[PDB]
Design a protein around this motif. Structure first.
Motif, mmCIF file in Angstrom:
data_model
loop_
_atom_site.group_PDB
_atom_site.id
_atom_site.type_symbol
_atom_site.label_atom_id
_atom_site.label_comp_id
_atom_site.label_asym_id
_atom_site.label_seq_id
_atom_site.Cartn_x
_atom_site.Cartn_y
_atom_site.Cartn_z
ATOM 1 N N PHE A 24 0.819 -1.204 0.000
ATOM 2 C CA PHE A 24 0.000 0.000 0.000
ATOM 3 C C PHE A 24 0.858 1.260 0.000
ATOM 4 O O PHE A 24 0.934 1.947 1.025
ATOM 5 C CB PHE A 24 -0.933 -0.006 1.232
ATOM 6 C CG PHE A 24 -1.782 -1.254 1.361
ATOM 7 C CD1 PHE A 24 -2.542 -1.719 0.289
ATOM 8 C CD2 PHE A 24 -1.837 -1.957 2.565
ATOM 9 C CE1 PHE A 24 -3.328 -2.861 0.406
ATOM 10 C CE2 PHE A 24 -2.623 -3.098 2.689
ATOM 11 C CZ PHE A 24 -3.370 -3.550 1.610
ATOM 12 N N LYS A 26 2.060 5.045 -0.330
ATOM 13 C CA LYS A 26 1.357 6.258 0.087
ATOM 14 C C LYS A 26 2.271 7.481 0.104
ATOM 15 O O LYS A 26 3.500 7.372 0.049
ATOM 16 C CB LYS A 26 0.774 6.053 1.493
ATOM 17 C CG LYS A 26 -0.601 6.668 1.728
ATOM 18 C CD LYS A 26 -0.786 7.135 3.168
ATOM 19 C CE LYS A 26 -2.237 7.041 3.628
ATOM 20 N NZ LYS A 26 -2.712 5.641 3.837
ATOM 21 N N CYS A 28 2.201 11.155 2.608
ATOM 22 C CA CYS A 28 1.582 11.853 3.734
ATOM 23 C C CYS A 28 2.074 13.293 3.788
ATOM 24 O O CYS A 28 3.186 13.593 3.351
ATOM 25 C CB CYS A 28 1.900 11.134 5.044
ATOM 26 S SG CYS A 28 1.140 9.501 5.178
ATOM 27 N N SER A 33 1.515 11.852 10.663
ATOM 28 C CA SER A 33 0.561 11.124 9.821
ATOM 29 C C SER A 33 1.171 9.809 9.350
ATOM 30 O O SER A 33 0.528 8.750 9.412
ATOM 31 C CB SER A 33 0.127 11.971 8.618
ATOM 32 O OG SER A 33 -0.847 11.297 7.834
ATOM 33 N N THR A 37 0.070 5.959 10.098
ATOM 34 C CA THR A 37 -0.153 5.025 8.989
ATOM 35 C C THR A 37 0.605 3.721 9.246
ATOM 36 O O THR A 37 0.049 2.613 9.103
ATOM 37 C CB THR A 37 0.280 5.622 7.633
ATOM 38 O OG1 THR A 37 -0.245 6.949 7.499
ATOM 39 C CG2 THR A 37 -0.221 4.767 6.474
#
Length: 50
Positions: A24, A26, A28, A33, A37
């Motif tokens: 996954f 990502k 941020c 944050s 996560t």
RNA sequence: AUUUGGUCAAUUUGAAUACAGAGAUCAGCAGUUCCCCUGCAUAAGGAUGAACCGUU
């Protein structure tokens, strides 16, 4: 031009239970944050702030 | 000085028939082993490529 950018292998271990359901990727807006996560897999400890 | 080294077998016999005794030659291909190349599979083990952002 990114001569400054580089990569380092932080860890190279064995985990007891792999809580990562997939891959996954990502982005941020902030570090907190990101940490949050990471801790979605009960593992904030991976990140090494330097 | 003489002589042995000289018995055809087979069949019909109770000597006759036989008459030397019954596949050859030329050529393929496959297999067997080892080797080399080639394509595929199986494991393993690399090496590398590919835009752009992802998932609670």
């Amino acid at each position: 031009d990114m001569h400054n950018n580089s990569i380092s292998k932080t860890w190279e271990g064995y985990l007891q239970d792999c809580k990562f359901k997939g891959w996954f990727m990502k982005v941020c807006n902030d570090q907190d944050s990101l940490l949050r996560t990471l801790g979605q897999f009960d593992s904030e400890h991976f990140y090494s702030p330097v």
